[PDB]
Structure formats: structure tokens, C-alpha cells
Amino acid sequence: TVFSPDGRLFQVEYAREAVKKGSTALGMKFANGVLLISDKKVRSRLIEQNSIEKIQLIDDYVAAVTSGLVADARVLVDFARISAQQEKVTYGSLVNIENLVKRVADQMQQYTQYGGVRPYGVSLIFAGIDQIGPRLFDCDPAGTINEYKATAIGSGKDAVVSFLEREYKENLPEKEAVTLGIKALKSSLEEGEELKAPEIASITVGNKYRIYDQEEVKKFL
Amino acid sequence: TVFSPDGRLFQVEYAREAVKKGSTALGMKFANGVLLISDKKVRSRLIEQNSIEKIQLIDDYVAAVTSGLVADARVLVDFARISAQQEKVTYGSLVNIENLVKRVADQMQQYTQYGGVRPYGVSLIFAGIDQIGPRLFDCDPAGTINEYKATAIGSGKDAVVSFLEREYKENLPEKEAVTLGIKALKSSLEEGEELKAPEIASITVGNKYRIYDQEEVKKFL
Amino acid sequence: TVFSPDGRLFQVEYAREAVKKGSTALGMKFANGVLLISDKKVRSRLIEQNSIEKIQLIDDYVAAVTSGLVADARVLVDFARISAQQEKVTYGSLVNIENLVKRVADQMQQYTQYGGVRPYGVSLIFAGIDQIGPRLFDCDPAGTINEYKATAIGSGKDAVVSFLEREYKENLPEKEAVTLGIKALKSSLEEGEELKAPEIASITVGNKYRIYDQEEVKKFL
Amino acid sequence: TVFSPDGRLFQVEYAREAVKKGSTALGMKFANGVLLISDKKVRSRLIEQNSIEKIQLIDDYVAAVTSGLVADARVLVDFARISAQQEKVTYGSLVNIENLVKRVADQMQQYTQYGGVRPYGVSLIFAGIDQIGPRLFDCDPAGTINEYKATAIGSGKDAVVSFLEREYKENLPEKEAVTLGIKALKSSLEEGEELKAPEIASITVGNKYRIYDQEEVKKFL
Amino acid sequence: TVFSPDGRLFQVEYAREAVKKGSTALGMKFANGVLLISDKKVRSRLIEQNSIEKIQLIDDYVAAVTSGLVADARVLVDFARISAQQEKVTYGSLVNIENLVKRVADQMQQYTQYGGVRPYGVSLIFAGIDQIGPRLFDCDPAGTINEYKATAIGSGKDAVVSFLEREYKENLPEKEAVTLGIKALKSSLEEGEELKAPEIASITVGNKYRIYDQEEVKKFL
Amino acid sequence: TTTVGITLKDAVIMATERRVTMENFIMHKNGKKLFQIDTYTGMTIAGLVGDAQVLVRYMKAELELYRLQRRVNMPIEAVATLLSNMLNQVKYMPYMVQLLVGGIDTAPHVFSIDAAGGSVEDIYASTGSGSPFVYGVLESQYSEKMTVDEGVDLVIRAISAAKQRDSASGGMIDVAVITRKDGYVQLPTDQIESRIRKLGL
Amino acid sequence: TTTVGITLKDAVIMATERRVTMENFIMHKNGKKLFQIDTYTGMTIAGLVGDAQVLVRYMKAELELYRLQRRVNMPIEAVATLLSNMLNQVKYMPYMVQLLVGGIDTAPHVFSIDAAGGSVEDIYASTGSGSPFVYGVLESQYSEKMTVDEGVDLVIRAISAAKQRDSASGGMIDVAVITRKDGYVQLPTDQIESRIRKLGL
Amino acid sequence: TTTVGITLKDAVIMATERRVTMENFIMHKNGKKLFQIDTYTGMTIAGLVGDAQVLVRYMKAELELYRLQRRVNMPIEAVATLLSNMLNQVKYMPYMVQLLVGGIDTAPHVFSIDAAGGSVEDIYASTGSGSPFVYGVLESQYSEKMTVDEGVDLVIRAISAAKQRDSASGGMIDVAVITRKDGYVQLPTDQIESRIRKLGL
Amino acid sequence: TTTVGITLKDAVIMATERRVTMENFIMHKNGKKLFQIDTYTGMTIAGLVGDAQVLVRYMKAELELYRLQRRVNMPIEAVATLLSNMLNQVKYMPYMVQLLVGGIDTAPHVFSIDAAGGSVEDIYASTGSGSPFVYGVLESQYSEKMTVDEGVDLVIRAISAAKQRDSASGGMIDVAVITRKDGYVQLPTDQIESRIRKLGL
Q1: Which chains contact E through at least 3 pairs of Cβ atoms less than 8 Å apart?
Q2: Which among A40, A202, A68 is positioned nearest to A124, based on CA atoms?
Q3: Contact assessment for residue G9 and residue G143, using Cβ atoms and an 8 Å cutoff
Q4: Measured between CB atoms, does H28 come within 8 Å of chain D?
Q5: Where are the beta strands (DSSP E) in chain F?
């Protein structure tokens, strides 16, 4: 990875293109909690859907969704899990999610600076509750971090964000937040398509991360 | 391995082409068990067929078939065997096959990210029974993992899958599952060819992995 | 990174181009203190502005702002923080800020001399108070250090400096220094645009670094 | 760095071009002492001139000036300082300055022979008094060392040397040596320009290195 | 460094071209001793000639002259000095100069075989007296060693050797050997030029290496 | 120190004393020896406090990561096996501890793990300087057909007896009960004190 | 050495003696054992001076960096946990120290940390050769419902008693009080001397 | 060995004895224990000669480099802190030394540094086998309101007393005075001998 | 072993005995302890022969290389400083030696270097088991205003006395004289024997 005459890093920009081809997922803050929704694309019938999860847990109070190269995403998630455990052993607990996200982002950043390796073709959304409150972060291939009230990654990122920028309201009831999230995903669909029951997970202050059941998802679909 | 302007990794895609030239094999779940069938291609008569096995065992309850570069496949199988033993020594037993598959996939993933090496030109199918139940996974050169009810690898992959998507039924008797598998392979043959007695292995819950004898195979052929 | 026939290092010059695309920030000395102002660009409404800080603290008496590749900047800031702590442990206190800046610059310089890595696409401004007095330094991708009475980095660097060269006065009251800084940033704006409440921090001799509140900023805007 | 068909090393020659673009400085021996003068170029008014020094001390009896890439020069000066301290710890004192210069030059030479690195774009002048007497050395990017009665580096090198070759006299009074040095620098100026108060330092036998004050410099300007 | 279709190593041949541009020096055996003469080229008047030596000592009974890249030559001389000391510590004394020369040549040879480095652009002449007698060796960039009765290196090598092949006589008196050496150098001069007092050193059996004074040189000039 | 763990038809009951000795006196009257390390798994520690606390932190991290990765709680025997390996690897520079690991998978289990990594499963076990007194009580009164309430009372009596003879034992009794239905439940001191009075202790 | 730390409803009070022994005599009458390591956190040291001073420097650096990175003061329990790990890692080549860590988060806490990395929370604790005398006084006079001023007086009495029996104890008493309102506050010697006179000590 | 360092209003006075013992006898009557290590900083050594001489060379190099890099003389406390770290790092393979570091920044300071890296600031201190005798004299005669000349005389008396009881002490007395005005000044033996006669020693 | 080195106005005189002990008997009557290591520098060794011989070889190589590189003879103090560093670096696995280094720069110097790297300059010194006897003689008879011939005679008497009381001492006396004019000169046995007879020894 080297600089162009414009001061650009092409391998990083190309990695971003890989991300754009991944599945669509979004996250949004709501009253005393954070919501994650993944637009799981259903293909074939020979796939064991029961074993396919898009929302990973890093620990009981932190979750993430990824979009981009699947193999790379798996690796970064494992890294985040291990990193989270190291912090708990060292201090006794996790205090600020932001630092976990940074440790991950730094792992990604170095792959854009040192030769012999290619950057991770992965975009992540981190969500959870910590000492400060409910938090929601993005992390791109470059290793750039931003905290959001609401965000999205994947091929539908632009459509979903555009929708959210208009419709998103603060301090919504969990049910309203989920309802909104579903509408946002639907707006990103190709003409003639439909939204399959998405994977939904949420967490509220004082609780552990909660993953919705299949029936619970359908009720909002 | 670097990114193209499209966000693609050509060396990985090329590795996939190597896989497409390998032999055809399939796997399918059935009532309380998992079936593996390999379309061993018979050539010459000077080859010691008795010593040619396509279905490898990783341990008493886990088996795999591979397609692609033979030398690479052998290496990955050895890796999986060693990895499986490490888990048993560490915890006393193997609980979740999925984790074994991941350890293998991660070994493969890094070869697509670090320079100085080429990716493995190998696709694998893992099958076995663990704490959860009968399971069936694929793993490609990229290092991507998917759990299936039924799948296939090799040059006949597309034909076999197409067939299975139409004919596959859940919770079949072992004998029916084998019968179906044979039909699936036959559908992938070049016009004018025939199916030679394939290698068949299966496992049922509570038992160890069972490999069919020569006569047993012919009865379904 | 190698020399051209002109004795130039293109990768370094290209890194400088990356810096030119970053946000605008300035720093200026005033009577018994140093001021830092960052032109935080406000985009969208879905970004958690409360968590977005442009002025970092290295320690209680030293702060910095950066412009260029965000991921790289984060890394250098972390380096500076760790380095500052090492000095305190070794000697019991930080005596001369200049040396901290050099340690950072040297980290940057080596990336322009050794192959296998690219230079940091980051320009930094360091400010604080030490044994000598209030101090203000720049550090560019090359690893060049200069102490200023007033300076600026980012896309608006040229406009801001030009303004300051004309309007800057020594030994101003803090309030006058801030007022001047705001005017300087406004002069760098594209026609038709406006300045959003910038992030402001200052330190005076004998005190710790002080970050302005939101209301305090608006009073000068 | 490899050889051309002419037996030339282009990367070294290119490094020399980098040096030619640096500031001008000279050194000359005089009766029982050595003089260093640096043509500090004054730019802007927002630069803290009080903190800008061109003449570095390596130890109480040894000083140096550099011209070329600033970041590289800083690194070599630090190296020389550390090296000088190692010698004192090892033997109890510094006996021959020539050896210090060689240790620096050897650090530079290896960067012209090993791949993976670029040569230092720096020319240095070393001056001081040791067991033998007042001494004055140059060191270029190649790692070549020469002892001079009088010399110069930087863009004005050719003009200054030409002047000195004609006007230089041995065993001058310090005041006469300084007067001569100022004339030499003036002769190298572009038409219409003027010489700003230069940085001047000198050492005499039995004394420590002495840096001139601002008023002292003006008296000769 | 790789082979051409002719079995040639171009980087080595190019290094030889670098050598051809160096100063001229010769060596010759005489009755019970060995003589070294270096055609020091005098340039400018601002160079401290008193500190410029072309004939280096490796130890009290061994000396060398070099031609080619100056920085590289310095490095090889240092190597030879260190190597000579190691032998003395190990065995108590130096017995055969040939082995010292080989250790140096081997250091040079490896730079023509391993990548990542360039060959030394240096030709050396070694002379001294050991257990066997007065000896005189050459060593080129390739790492080739030859013992001579009389030899030469540098730009004037061809002219000097041609002369010596015709005029050289064995077992000459030291004074006659020096007289001859001076004539040999003069024959290599460009038309219209003159020979400046060269640096002369000699050693006789049972003695230590002796360097001629300035007046002694002029008497033969 | 006194730690006690017993199994019943479908439950594991573990209890400890709170006294901690440092610098040869009762520096702390209210320490902690009984830990939850998983949903259905608890651990008691004995021996050097420093070493023991470190091991607990490692085990918590290790089991949590296991759960997340494999989507299942680690088998109790596997938990014991980890410790066996962790401790044996440093047997020449060992942790100065004695551990009890208990919990439920498909059945209740209690493992006793020594500092050499030796791990043995049993019906009941105790560790610490007061363990000989606990064994006396359990050996005489323990019954496999006991109810969970009878179990809790026995554990209190066993520890209470140890507190009367072991000078290193003392403090309030901590009791935890693990069942599949409820999971790891730590009993209120209100209930424990009530039982203590009823038992005439 | 004598160090004392106690908790009250909403405050932590820590105090130490100043005497330092080197080469078997009272080389220094005015050393320092009570340190501020964070905005609301203090530490007292005991044992070998060299080791203790090094640990204090590390802790200051570690907590400052933590604050800057996470924009929040480290929890007291986390502070204790760091030390536990730092000390345990070198247990075979240990720091010869005994530490007290006290401060306020949402509540006042005092931790006692041994050289093995053993860390136990308590209501009050003391370290050093004179600690047995302090415990005597606190055990008899300490009350949870005490005011901050009553607290300070108790701490002075406890140390003063130690100074009368422990030959390794002596010097002026340093007292610091930590509250959320004021933060870490070091008391003037003027106030301490005044209290000493009033208490008839 | 006897080394003495005291502070006064605006000065630091340090002195030592010259006797050096090797192979159990007075091999050298005129060694050196008092060193200048910076413009306004001096050091005295005690303990093993080899170790001490090495440390002095390191400190000179370290402080000189510091000055050049930061364009300022290192604070005395920082000088002491370096030694603390240098010595503590090798505490298990230690330097067999006792050091005094004194000098002026904005105020005069004297630090006593042990082999464990323990560093404590004081008004006066002494090291070496004869230090107990020096403390006796200083404890009785030292006064904070003393002049620099009164200070020098006290230091001579204190060492002279040590020379009469400590068999390891002896030789001519070296005295150095550090002030901001003059910097580190080594007193002539002519002045010291004169004072010795006047004092009736 | 007995080695002696003294300074005079413009000269250094060094002498040793030749006896070498191995396996607890006089295995060698004619060893070598006095070495030239530079043009104007000599060294005497004592202690373990193996270690000492190795050091001499290193010093010769080190000083020769220095000369060639810097075109000047190394200062005597610098020579001593090297040894100090070389020996101190291995102080825990030390060379079992005692060295004397003497020579001329602008003045004559004699350094005594112990196995810990301790280096002290003096007017005269001696090493080896017989050194106490040499000191007796020198202490009584040595005079700073002595001539080089008077110096040589004193050195012979001092060693001769040691040979009469130290069972580890004996053999012919080696004497070397170092001056700027002549450099290191080893005296003929013919001259030494002549002096011995004249002195009535």
C-alpha cells in the first residue's frame, strides 16, 4: 500500500469496494438501548438457516455485525472477542466500548501501512452498553472510527442511511425503533423484491444482549 | 494477493478454478446421521484401488472429503487431524465440530492475506456428529464456512446441487438417503458415461463413523 | 521511498497531499498560554457529535490536533501518549515538550527511510506548557519540526496562515486570542459557507489544559 | 542502491542533489580555534526564531552544522551525540574527534550498500577541539570524510568555497575570522538579497564551545 | 547479482569500473622489504593535507592502499584491522599475511553472491612482512587474490604496470626501488601534468613499517 | 479455610467460610472464596489468595469465550480438565491452591483439583485447613437421598463444626445452590442465619 | 511503618507516619508514604522503599493513561486488580511491599493488597509493623456511623498508639481525606497538630 | 567511608574522606568519592569502588546528554529518580553502593539513595561506615539558619569526629560548595587545612 | 606473588618476581608477570594465571587498535578505565586478578585495579601475597625526590624483603623502567644481579 499523486491509498479504496458488495445491516440507538438488524439474504433451501447468524456477540453486553469479505470478518470478530477478554482479565471489567473498537481498528490500520499484507475487506458495526451508556460505532477498512445515533453498512448502506436521516427520531420505544428499522431495510430493496425475516438483536440498560426469536421477528416484518 | 479495482481477489478466484477441476463428492443429512459419497474416478488397472480412499477420517466421529489440488488437500486434512487432537487433550473431548472447521478455515484465510504464499486450491466437506447433532459444513479457498442440509463439491457440484435442491427430502432413512445420493451423482455424468462404485461413508447418532464395504456399495449402484 | 533525480522523495510529497485534504485547525500563543482551535465539520445528524473530539490530550499540560488520514493520526496520538508516560516514569516529570515532539517525529521519519512501509499521512500541532513556557510545534509527514508563535494545518492552512501573518499580535488576552482565531478560520471558508461552533481548548501557565464548553464557544462564534 | 555501467551509484548522487537544496553554512580554522557560521534564512514572522538553532552541540567541545533533509539531519545528530557519550563512558574522555566523525560516516555508508533503505540526504560539518588541536571535517551522503582548513555546505557551497580559496588566511584572530566568514556568505547571495544575522559559534583551545549572542552577531553583519 | 547468458556478473564488472576512477598507487618488492607508493592528488589549498593519508596500517608489519569508492575502502580497512587483532589474540601472533587478505576477500566475495547488497567498489593492495618473508597482494571487488612481485591499482594501473613489466628488477636497494616507483607513476600522468610529492612507506625484514617524511619524499621526486 | 461441595439427585450445593488470614492474623473477616464462573458452574478456592484470584479471572474469561464461540456451556469435566492442564504446566513453579469445581450438565458433578493438576470426581469434597472436620460430619450424616433443604442444613452443620476447631476458619457462611431450573443461586444471609438459629448452632 | 485507611458513609480517610529506616537506624524523619495516584484515589505504601516507589510511579502513569484513553477515572476495584496482576506476575521475584488503595467511585472503597497480588476489600485496614496496634484501637472504637471529623480523630489516635509501641513508627502524621465533593485533599499540619493537642496525645 | 551532605538557605555543602580500603588494608590514602556530575550537581559515593565508579560514569553521560537535548540542566529530583530506576532494575544483582545526590535548582536539595533504588530527600544526610558519628555531631550542632562558612566548619567537625572512631575512615577532607552564583566549587586544601587548625582539630 | 610499581619525577618503575605456583607447589621458577602493553605502558599481573594471561592479550589488541585508529597512544587513565569496565561487566563471574597499570603520558601514573573493576591512582602500589612486606619497605624508605637509580634500588630491596617472608614469592627479579626519552625498557639480569650484590641482598 503506497500513496498515489493525489495522496490516496488505492488498496484501501479497493477494499472499500469489496465492502459495498456485502449484505446490508443497520444499527440505531433508542431509549436506554441499542438495536442491530441484519438483512440476511435467503438463498437455496439446502442451507441450514438455523446455524446462520449475522449478529455476533463479543461479550454479554457487546455485539457486532459485519459486511464485506466473510472470511476476513470472521477473523476480526475473533480478534475482538479475545481482546475483550484480555481487558476483563486485566481490569476486572469492560468500562468503555470505544477502546475495544479502537483495538480492532488499530489491527486493521496497520495492514494499510505495512507491505506484505492486504487490508481487511470488512466494515463493522459495534453496539453495546457500558459505563457511559448505550453506544454504536462503525469501523471501515482504513481503520476509521465514528460513533453514530444511527448507521448502516453494506450494499444498501446509502439507501438505508438516506431513509434514516429523514425518519430517525431519538428516544424511541424499542418496538418503534424496530418498526422503523424494518421500514429502512425495505426501502433499500431492488424493485420487485421482498424482505425476508431479518436477524434482530437489542440490548437495554441493565440487561444482557437479547436476540429476537423467529416469531418475534415476523411480528414486525 | 491484492485487491482489484472491483474489490476482488484474483488469486482466490483462480484457486476456485482449480477446485472446479477436482472430483465430485456430496454430503447430505438424514434421520439421525450424515452421509458422505465420493465419485471416485477409476482409471487404468495398474492402480492399487484398495489403497485409494477419498473419505478421510479426522476422528472417530468426524470425516471429510476434498476436491481440488490433491497435495494441498492432504496437508489440510493432516492439519485438521492434529487440530482435533489438540482440542481433545485440552478439554477432554470434542464438543462442537463447527470450531474444528473454523480452525481449518482460518489456516486457509491467512494465505489469502499474507504475501509470499498462495491460497490453498482446495474445497472441503466436513461431516460428523457432536454435542448438538449431525452436522455438515463446506469450506472454500477463501476460508468461507457454511452449514448445509445437503451439498456438493467438485466439477459436478452444480449438477449435483441442482438435483438435490429439487429431490432432497429431510429425515430420510439411511438407505433412502444413499439411494438419492447415487441418483444425484449419476445426473452429473457426461453423456455416455457411467458411475463406478463410489466410496460411501455414514454416521448415525451414538455410533462411530461407518465406511461401506464394496458389496454394500454395489447394492445401491 | 527512494530519491528522484531532483533529490526529492515522492512518497513523502504524496503524503503531504493527503494532509492537504484534512480538516483545518490552528494554534496560537497568547499572554501566558497557548490556544488550539479545530474547525470541526458538521455532517449529517446521525453522528454522535458529543463523542467527536478533534483536540486530543497527551497529558494534563499537553494537547494536540491532527489533520490528514484519520487512522494514522490516531496511531501517532497513541504513540505520543505512551511516550509521554515513559518520560514521566523515567524522570518523574515532563520538562521539555520539544523532546516529546521529537520522539514522535522520529517515529515518522523512519517510515520515509525504510522500505516495506509507507509514511504517515498526518500533520500534527502540539501545544502545552512546560519548564520553559507555553510552546507550539508543528510536525509534518517527513518528520520536520518547527516552533511557531502561530500556525495552522489542513486544507485551510494557507488561508489561515496568510490571515494570521497580517493580523496576529503578541501577548493578547485569552479572549482576544480566541476572537482572532475565529476570524482566521472564517477567512478560509468557501464562499457561501459558514463556521460551525469549533472545538476550542486553551492552557495558561500554572493551570491544566482547559476545554471550552459548547456555550462558551458560541459566545465567540 | 546498485552500480550503473559507469560504476556510479545513482541513489547516492541523487541524495547529493537533495543536499544542494539546503541552507548554506561554513566553517573555518583560526588561531587556536574553530569557527562555525550558519546562514539561517528568515521566513515569516510567526516562527519562534528564538527556538531555531542551526548549530548543534554534540558535546561541550564538539559542534556541527547540517544541510539537506532536515529530518535526516536530526537523526544523524542524535546518533553522533549518543556515540560521543559511549566513547566517554568507555575511555573516560574523547581524544580524537576524527573517530566520532567516522562512526557517523559509517552509519551513513551502510545505507548506500544495503537494500531496503535509502541513503541520508545530509551533509555535515564537524568542528571542535581535541587532544591534537582544533579540527574541522565534512561528511557527505556517500560517507566520505575530509579534513579542511576551511569549508562550506549547502546551496551556497560553491560560491563560499570559491571566495574562501582566494581570501582565506591562516592563523587569523577570531574577530578577523568572523569578519571574513560574513563576507564569504554575502558573496553567495542572490542579486538584490541581503544577509540576515547568521548564527555564529566558535571555540578556542582550553575553552568550551561558545555561541554568540544576537548583539554580538550584528556587530559583524 | 545474477549471471548473464555469458556467465558474467555485471554488478561485479560495474564495480570494477568504479575502481578504475580511483587514485593510482603501486607496490613493489625489493631486497628484504616491500614498498608502497600512493599518488595523492592535490586539490585546493583549503584541505588539511597533513591529515590526508593514503597508506593505512593494519598492524605494525602490515599496510595497505586502496582505490575506488572511498567510503567502501574505509570500511574494508577497518574490517582488516579488526580481523588482524582477532588472529593475534587467538594465536598470539600473525604468521601468514595471506590469510588476513583472504579473510578480507571472503568478506567481499559474499557481497557478489547474496542479494540485498551491492559489491564493494574497492581494489586493495596489501603489503608486509611475516613468517615467510616480504609479501605483496592484490584484492579486487570479485574477491580475487594474487601475489605479486610488483603491481598497481587505480586509473593509472595499466600505465604503471606496463612500465614495471619492462623496467622492474628484482632485489633492488630500497633507494633504487623508490626511484623506480616514482618514474613509474610519472609515466602514467596526463600530458602537461606533474607528480606531486607522493606518499611513501616501506618495510624491511626485522623492522616495523616505516613511513617517509615530507622531505624524504621530495629527495626522490 | 473451609470449603464444602456436595451433590444431590439434581443439585450441587457449595459453601465456604469468609475469614482471610494475612501477615499471621485475621486481617479480613469478610473475604470471598465462592465464585460463579459460569451459568451453572461455581468454584471455591483455597490456599494462597493471590494465586487463587488470578485463576478465577482466567477461568471466567476462558469459559465465557468458550460459550460464545461454541454456543454452548462448557461441560463440567472439561472445566476441570482445563485447570488440570493449566496447573500441571507450571507444576515446578506451581499455584499454591486447592480448588473445587461444581456444576450441572446433564448431571451434577463435583471435582477436586490439587496444585499438581490432579483432578478427581466425587460425591462430596472439601478443601482447606478445616476440611478434616467437614469430612467427619459428612461421613457420618451425608445421605444420597437427601433433599436440597436437608443438603443445605448439612453443609451449614459441617462448616459450623470446622469453625469450632480450625483456628484458620471463621466468618459468615456463604452458600450457593446450583440447579438446572434456577441456575447458580447465591443464598441470602437472611436465610442462612435463619437456618443457623433453627439448627441450634 | 504504620498506614491506616478507613471508610465512612461517603468518604475515605487515609493516614501514615513519616519515619523511614535505612541501614538499621532512623535515617529519615520525614519521608512519604501517602500518595495521590488519581483524582479520587490514594495509595499508601509499606515495605521496601525502593520497590514501593517504583510501583507508585507505574500506577500514576497507568491511571493517567487510562483516564485519557477512556475519558473516565478508573474504578477503584480495577485499580486494585491491576496491582494484583502486576505483583502476581513476579511472585517468584516479588516486590517486597504491602499496599492500601482507597478512593471513591459511587462508593468509598479500601483495598488491602499483599505482595502475592492478593487483594481483599474491607471497611478498614492497616499495614506496616505497627498495624497490630492500629487494629486494636480501630476494633474497639471504630463506628460505621462516624462523621468525617470523628473519623480523622480516630485515625490520629490509632496511629498515635502505634507510635508508642512500634519502634519502627514515628514522625509527623500525614492525613488525607477523599470525598466526591472535594476530591483528594491533603490536610495541613496545622490542623493535624491542633487535633493532636485537643485529643491529649 | 564517610560522606556528608547538608543544605543551607541557598547552598549545598558536601564533603568526604579520601581513604580507600582494598584487600583488607589501607591500600590508598588519596582516593576520590566526591564528584561533580553537572553544573550545579554533585555526588558522593560509598560501598564497592568498582560499582560506584561505573555509576558515576553513567550519570555524567546521562546528564550531559539530557542537557544538550533539552537545553536545560536536569532537576535534582529527576537525577535521583534516574538512579532509583537504574538501581532497582538490578535489585537482584545489585550495585553495592550508597549514594548522596545534592545540588541546586530553584532550591538546594539532598537525596539519599540506597542500593534498592530507595530515594529519600532530607536536610542533611551521611553515608559510609562512619555515618553514625556524623549524625551524632549534626544532630546536636546543625542549625537551619547557619551561614555557608558556619556550614563548612560543621561539616569538617562532623567528619573529623568520624575519623576518630571509624577505622575505615581517614585521609584529607574534600569539601565542595554548590551555589547558584558560583556553581559547583571545590575548596582548596589550603582553606580546609586552615579551617582545621582554627577549629582545634 | 609480588608486584611493585612506583612513580618518580619523570619515570615509572615496575618490578615483579617470577615464581608461579600450580597444583600447590613451585611448578615454575621462571614465569612472567610484567608485560609491555604499549610503547609507554606496562602491566603487572597477579592472581589466577589463566585469567590474567587472557586479559593481557585483550589489552594488547585493544591498545594497538586504538593507536592505529586514532594515531595516538592511549592515555594511561583511559587504559585503566577500559579494564575497569571489562572487569566490572563480569563482576558476578569475575576474573580472579589484581592488576597494576603504569606508564607515561604527560606525567607518570600508576593505577591499581581490583577484580571488581575498582581503579585508583597512586604514587606507589603493590599486588600479590607479598604486597604487605613491600608496603612496609616503601612506607619507610620511599621518597618523592628519588632518582631513577635510587628508585630501582628501592624496588629491589622491597621485593627482596617480600621474598624472605612470603612463601609464594621467589625467583629472579624483573625490573622495567618507563621514560619518555627511552620508552619501556626492560633491565638486563646482569644489571639487576649487580645491584643485588651491591645492596648486600
Answers
A1: D, I
A2: A68
A3: no
A4: no
A5: 3-8, 11-16, 20-22, 25-28, 34-38, 41-44, 99-104, 108-113, 119-122, 124-127, 174-179, 183-186
Closest CA to D88 of D74, D75, D77, D99: D99
Q: Do B102 and A74 touch (CB under 8 A)?
A: yes
CA atoms of B161 and B123, how far apart (whole Å) = 15
Give the minimum alpha-carbon distance from C99 to chain H in angstroms, rounded to a whole number.
7
CA separation, residue G190 to residues D220, G32, G147, G176, I21 (Å): 61, 18, 20, 13, 73
Q: Which domains does chain C have, with CATH numbers?
A: 1-221 (3.60.20.10)
Q: A with C: how many residue pairs have Cβ under 8 Å apart? A: 82
H73 CB-near residues (< 8 Å, 6+ apart): H38, H39, H40, H41, H63, H67, H105
How many C-beta neighbours within 10 Å does residue C196 have?
12
- Report CB contact under 8 Å: G72, A98: no
First to last CA, chain A: 44
Contact (Cβ atoms closer than 8 angstroms) between residue E13 and residue E118: no
Phi, psi of E139 (to 5 degrees): -145, 120
CA angle E184, E188, E190 (to 5 degrees): 145
Closest residue, chain F, to A81 (C-alpha):
F65
| Chain-chain contact of A48 with B149 (C-beta, under 8 angstroms) | yes
Option in A47, A119, A121 nearest B146 (CB):
A47
Cell of E138: 592484490
Residue the block writes with cell 582505490:
E67
Domains and CATH numbers, chain H: 1-201 (3.60.20.10)
Instruction: Tell me the CA distances in angstroms from F197 to F151, F191, F194, I39, one per residue in order.
Output: 16, 10, 5, 97
Q: What is the identity of the amino acid at A142?
A: A
Residue E125 pairs in a beta bridge with E65, E138
D and E: number of Cβ contacts within 8 A: 83
Q: Judge A/F contact: 3 or more CB pairs < 8 A.
A: yes
Strand duo D62-68 + D55-59: pairing: antiparallel
Q: Do D98 and I78 lie within an 8 Å CB cutoff?
A: no
- Separation in Å, CA A47 to CA B16, B148, B158, B201, G127: 20, 4, 15, 21, 64
Three-class HEC string of chain I? CCEEEEEECCEEEEEECCCEEECCEEEECCCCCEEEEECCEEEECCECHHHHHHHHHHHHHHHHHHHHHHCCCCCHHHHHHHHHHHHHCCCCCCCCECEEEEEECCCEEEEEECCCCCEEEECEEEECCCHHHHHHHHHHHCCCCCCHHHHHHHHHHHHHHHHCCCCCCCCCCEEEEEECCCEEEECCHHHHHHHHHHCCC
F touches which chains (3+ CB pairs under 8 A)? A, B, G
Task: Quickly list DSSP for C142-164.
Answer: T--EEEBSEEEESTTHHHHHHHH
G160 touches chain F (CB under 8 A): no
For residue C144, CA distances in Å to C9, C22, C103, D75, D139 come to 14, 19, 12, 11, 21
Determine contact, residues G27/C55, Cβ cutoff 8 Å.
no
CB contact under 8 A, G64 and C92: no
Catalytically active residues of I are: 1
- Cell for C164? 494570521
Resolution attained, angstroms: 2.8
Contact assessment for residue A22 and residue A155, using Cβ atoms and an 8 Å cutoff: yes
The experimental technique used to determine this model is cryo-EM
G116-147 burial code (b ≥16 CB/10 A, e <16): bbbbbbbbbbbbbbbbbbbbebbeeebeeebe
Please indicate whether chains I and H are in contact, defined as at least 3 beta carbon pairs under 8 Å: yes
B105, closest residue in chain A (CA to CA): A71
Asked whether the beta carbons of residue I68 and residue E59 sit closer than 8 angstroms, the reply is yes
Question: Can you tell me which residue has the cell 603504569?
Answer: I102
